[PDB]
Amino acid sequence: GSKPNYALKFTLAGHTKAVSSVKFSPNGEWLASSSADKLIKIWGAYDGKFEKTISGHKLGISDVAWSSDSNLLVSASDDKTLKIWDVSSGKCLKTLKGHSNYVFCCNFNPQSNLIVSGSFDESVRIWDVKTGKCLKTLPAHSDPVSAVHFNRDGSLIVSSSYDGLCRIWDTASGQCLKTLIDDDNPPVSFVKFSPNGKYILAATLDNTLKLWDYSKGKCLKTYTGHKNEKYCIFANFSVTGGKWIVSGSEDNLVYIWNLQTKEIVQKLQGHTDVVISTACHPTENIIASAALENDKTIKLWKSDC
Numbered sequence: 001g002s003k004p005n006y007a008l009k010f011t012l013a014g015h016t017k018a019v020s021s022v023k024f025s026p027n028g029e030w031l032a033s034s035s036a037d038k039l040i041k042i043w044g045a046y047d048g049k050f051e052k053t054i055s056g057h058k059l060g061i062s063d064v065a066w067s068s069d070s071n072l073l074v075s076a077s078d079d080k081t082l083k084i085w086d087v088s089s090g091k092c093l094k095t096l097k098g099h100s101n102y103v104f105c106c107n108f109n110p111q112s113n114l115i116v117s118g119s120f121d122e123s124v125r126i127w128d129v130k131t132g133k134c135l136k137t138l139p140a141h142s143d144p145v146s147a148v149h150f151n152r153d154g155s156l157i158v159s160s161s162y163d164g165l166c167r168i169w170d171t172a173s174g175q176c177l178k179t180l181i182d183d184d185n186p187p188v189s190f191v192k193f194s195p196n197g198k199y200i201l202a203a204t205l206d207n208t209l210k211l212w213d214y215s216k217g218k219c220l221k222t223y224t225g226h227k228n229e230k231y232c233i234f235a236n237f238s239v240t241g242g243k244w245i246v247s248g249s250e251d252n253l254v255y256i257w258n259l260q261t262k263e264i265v266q267k268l269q270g271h272t273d274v275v276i277s278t279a280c281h282p283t284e285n286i287i288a289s290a291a292l293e294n295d296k297t298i299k300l301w302k303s304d305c
Ligand SMILES: COC(=O)N(CCCCc1nc(CO)c[nH]1)Cc1ccccc1
Pocket: 018, 019, 020, 021, 036, 062, 063, 104, 105, 146, 147, 148, 189, 190, 230, 231, 232, 233, 234, 276, 292, 293
């Protein structure tokens, strides 16, 4: 109960370069993986069964995100585009063009009528899904944008940058609501809202995770013990069993913390390169983890708690 007991169930091989992200569909039936090999792969969430490859990007992919109804994906690519995909058909519906450098991060709003993107071009863009047109270009940061995420009602966007800032944006106007983290340094490598939209989980490249109260703009919790000085490693709120914080690490482990106590409650051993990305199953106590170039595999882990 008080600790999870995640154990390896499946290893998913198929990517020929570093995996860049993994995401479970909201309906829980699929895992989507993006890679430097320019491919998206779709896997059975429960049995890790390879479903299909989705291809079309001309260069490597840094991120993929699911629509709310689990019917679409958006990918962010070094080819300076995002692509919206129909998962069923595997077809590119739209190519989102406007970024002037690598597109690093992406997400749909809960309504799934918008996509938010972050680029090496230091901008955040908001896209209309239906038309594939850019609605707003936000001069968000003074260095590459590491993460973008909408809160639970779609009214807010949180961004992070190598400029060391975390900023929250009014979706409707694109105007800045507050700069949460305002330090020269270190680089903010990842941010996302908590499921209730009250808190922001932020990674910094000083081996630190911080849980911020958005309203008060104050740090509540710090999570340490893992290695993170180079890569934009995802972090998750695990909510299906015990309330954990989950992250990859440059020491090739998955770290699990107790959200409240900040104690490490498990380290998952198995990968042979940096764990860049972790995802938590929406219903079951299942973690997916993905590793860089030496490894190029995705691991599915299952816990009783
Ligand atoms: C600093 O850049 C990186 O973290 N990577 C890892 C892959 C992308 C991971 C990623 N996190 C996010 C956080 O929003 C989006 N995408 C790029 C990379 C790929 C392959 C080899 C070396 C570096």
